Amino acid sequence: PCSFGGVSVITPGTNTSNQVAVLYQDVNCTEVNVFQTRAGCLIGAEHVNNSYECDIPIGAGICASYQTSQSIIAYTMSLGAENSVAYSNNSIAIPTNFTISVTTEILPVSMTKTS
Amino acid sequence: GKIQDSLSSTASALGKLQDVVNQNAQALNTLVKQLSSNFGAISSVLNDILSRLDKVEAEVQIDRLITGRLQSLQTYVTQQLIRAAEIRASANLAATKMSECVLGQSKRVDFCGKGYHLMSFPQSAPHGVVFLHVTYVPAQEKNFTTAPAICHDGKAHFPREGVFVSNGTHWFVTQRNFYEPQIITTDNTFVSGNCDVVIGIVNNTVYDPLQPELDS
Amino acid sequence: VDCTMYICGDSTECSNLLLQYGSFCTQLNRALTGIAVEQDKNTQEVFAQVKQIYKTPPIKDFGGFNFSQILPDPSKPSKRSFIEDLLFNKVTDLICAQKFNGLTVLPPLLTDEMIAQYTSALLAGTITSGWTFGAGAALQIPFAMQMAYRFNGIGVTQNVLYENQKLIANQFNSAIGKIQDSLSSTASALGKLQDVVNQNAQALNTLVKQLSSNFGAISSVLNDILSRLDKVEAEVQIDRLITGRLQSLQTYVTQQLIRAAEIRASANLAATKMSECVLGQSKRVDFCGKGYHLMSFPQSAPHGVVFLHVTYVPAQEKNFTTA
Amino acid sequence: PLSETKCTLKSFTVEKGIYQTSNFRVQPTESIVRFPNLCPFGEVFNATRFASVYAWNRKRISNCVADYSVLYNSASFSTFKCYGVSPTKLNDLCF
Ligand SMILES: *[C@@H]1O[C@H](CO)[C@@H](O)[C@H](O)[C@H]1NC(C)=O
Ligand SMILES: *[C@@H]1O[C@H](CO)[C@@H](O)[C@H](O)[C@H]1NC(C)=O
Ligand SMILES: *[C@@H]1O[C@H](CO)[C@@H](O)[C@H](O)[C@H]1NC(C)=O
Ligand SMILES: *[C@@H]1O[C@H](CO)[C@@H](O)[C@H](O)[C@H]1NC(C)=O
Ligand SMILES: *[C@@H]1O[C@H](CO)[C@@H](O)[C@H](O)[C@H]1NC(C)=O
Ligand SMILES: *[C@@H]1O[C@H](CO)[C@@H](O)[C@H](O)[C@H]1NC(C)=O
Ligand SMILES: *[C@@H]1O[C@H](CO)[C@@H](O)[C@H](O)[C@H]1NC(C)=O
Ligand SMILES: *[C@@H]1O[C@H](CO)[C@@H](O)[C@H](O)[C@H]1NC(C)=O
Ligand SMILES: *[C@@H]1O[C@H](CO)[C@@H](O)[C@H](O)[C@H]1NC(C)=O
């Protein structure tokens, strides 16, 4: 069979750039600046060791973002920022100050009725 | 005030709503375009098949129109049913939040959004609802030595509510979600067991409200 | 699924006919993508509710509560708690066969190793920071002083734990042990997951086998039919293939939509538990599982999640006249 | 491969995020026809004596090559039709 999967055009908004990085899904970078991924053959995005927040989800952890001149990059998504709680047998941390935050939450209720 | 700035420039936060309105008009569009498709018949105009041919042939063709269009409905319809239930579950969730969050105070965690929940203010939106969740988020923390228990005379003292803490010297019992130290007296602490069993009990002296009240 | 390539296998003759059904081919991709998108939204909602990745401290003193079972295994190349390996062995060619005809399996956005970092974080904060990490910045608290609260949650005064700690330690640990064999010695516990994976691979097999059906057409092979049957007449034949196959997709697609809508419901149930049960302490009776609930430990499993609910069940009764 | 995304999006402004546009399949460089006498059509079709239909003659034929050209070039034949497979195409697909 053919490589298939599908072509995928990774782009920052057309407003930002007209540059795109093409992802060939689930293929070998032969039959096509090239990089081989877990999700397939990616073209036109420079691999970046610096792991950042997942921005444009691609596959298998590969997440692309536009910033650095500039070029679309591809990098292993860092899940979260890292922390290690400083923990002891009697160590406790009790908040002395707080905030009151208003977080919008949005839900559908009904949809357009038709006949 | 931050909310109104967000909405002022945010098209995305309504993505949930904007998607629902889209997906309907989408399938509505596609439903319409299916009126222009041949479906194998010689044309997608109903009458133009007729006036071209003598009807005993049209009876055959109009099948491939009907068989096509009738299907395209059942596709669209079966979609709506599925999509309806998707809204249906969302509507049930809205009733649950409207009921519990707004009309109550939700002990459930992160059902009303991050932080401990105070109240919610619903706001209507086209084919939807928008809650403003007012939540209580702690902020500034201070590392503090703690103990699960305090010996006094060999009795053990445990806090009624909150925990024994200490900056480094004076043991204070305080409520948990806010730092409000108070000197430790019997009204703060109840007696149980004795000093052997607890793991982590310290020494200290639990002041007595009553003892001074006597002395005169 | 590739609608054009699936229905009409490398043949323009059939491919042109498909254009006369209009947007069926495209709206199927629009349908399946809607599924495929929210799948990585489900896994997103469930596992990552936590802002930061916490990690357990270097040295484990919890007051006797062994966690080496459930905590990430530092010696595995993919760090996954000892238990999670029991799971990934139970759950399980279809590797390229489907991928012949345009049936593709896209990689889940989050690799399993990432899922195991979340369920490490959620489990790292649960242990050290109590429940506060879901409400904001995590607050280190002595684990034994955590469990004093989670008893106050269920109405047992904390003086029970400070006195019974050693006992409660053993009951906990010995309870964790049997969770291994509960999984290790029986393969039906994971049926829920196993059923999901099967039904997916099921319909795919069915969807493939539909390629070999005549559907009233002289031959199931499209290339052979185009090569032998005369273009004038072969048109009508290929219809019965297309009409058959094109229908047979909508059957498969509709199944996936319906089936995903179930998972979509099950995902929220997890995300509800993950938020309320793991991150907080649940007051909802038998929502977290039978008994008064203390805490829950998430554990990843293939295309699923597994919670270890630590619950408080009373035992020995004493008849006593009351007033 | 970028302009196809605008057609799929149906918007001159393609907002951020990944879009599936099209699928690419490698073209076959060339064709392999790998077949492994003469068939007695001059002995069947120019035969001198056909039996009737109560005892019709049957001749199993294999291990030879088809002269399907002059079948169509004969053109002295009243009723000649092929069911399922078309006669002209059957020149090369074989049996
Ligand atoms: C592009 O986006 C920026 C914000 O990032 C906005 O200020 C600008 O007006 C946008 N331009 C267009 C062409 O919409
Ligand atoms: C194809 O992909 C595999 C795995 O990445 C790689 O080992 C191989 O060299 C690639 N090329 C061939 C020969 O298919
Ligand atoms: C980034 O990772 C690649 C992996 O092959 C390595 O070859 C390269 O040297 C690394 N670059 C830096 C600066 O870490
Ligand atoms: C914690 O336990 C260890 C080992 O018993 C001990 O050395 C350390 O001082 C203890 N820390 C506190 C503050 O309880
Ligand atoms: C907490 O921080 C805010 C910042 O404006 C300050 O106004 C407030 O006084 C602080 N807490 C207290 C109890 O003062
Ligand atoms: C407590 O001490 C640790 C030491 O690493 C530090 O990381 C943490 O931020 C401190 N927390 C507070 C509340 O000061
Ligand atoms: C506490 O006070 C007692 C005497 O009442 C003393 O024996 C003990 O060493 C002190 N420290 C501890 C660990 O309780
Ligand atoms: C937990 O159990 C494992 C079983 O091998 C043991 O090796 C480990 O020492 C135990 N840890 C504690 C703290 O009991
Ligand atoms: C209480 O008495 C009843 C009736 O004799 C008996 O069935 C039950 O087991 C007793 N329960 C206890 C706590 O002994």
PDB file of C-alpha atoms in Angstrom, chain C residues 40 58 65 74 88 130 139 150 153 164 166 180 221 250-251 269 311:
ATOM      1  CA  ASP C  40      -7.493  14.230  22.393  1.00  0.00           C
ATOM      2  CA  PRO C  58      13.647  11.966  46.605  1.00  0.00           C
ATOM      3  CA  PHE C  65       2.171   4.082  53.729  1.00  0.00           C
ATOM      4  CA  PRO C  74      12.587   5.120  38.349  1.00  0.00           C
ATOM      5  CA  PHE C  88      -0.496  -2.558  29.692  1.00  0.00           C
ATOM      6  CA  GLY C 130      -3.117  17.148  49.951  1.00  0.00           C
ATOM      7  CA  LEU C 139       0.845  23.261  49.684  1.00  0.00           C
ATOM      8  CA  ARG C 150      -9.743  13.079  55.172  1.00  0.00           C
ATOM      9  CA  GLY C 153     -14.273  14.644  55.885  1.00  0.00           C
ATOM     10  CA  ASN C 164      -4.255   3.903  64.777  1.00  0.00           C
ATOM     11  CA  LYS C 166       0.561   2.059  62.391  1.00  0.00           C
ATOM     12  CA  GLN C 180      -1.654  -6.466  41.998  1.00  0.00           C
ATOM     13  CA  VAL C 221     -12.965  -6.241  -7.278  1.00  0.00           C
ATOM     14  CA  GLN C 250     -22.160   5.800   6.908  1.00  0.00           C
ATOM     15  CA  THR C 251     -23.010   2.720   8.925  1.00  0.00           C
ATOM     16  CA  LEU C 269     -17.317  10.701  34.452  1.00  0.00           C
ATOM     17  CA  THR C 311     -12.064   3.979  51.256  1.00  0.00           C
TER      18      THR C 311
END
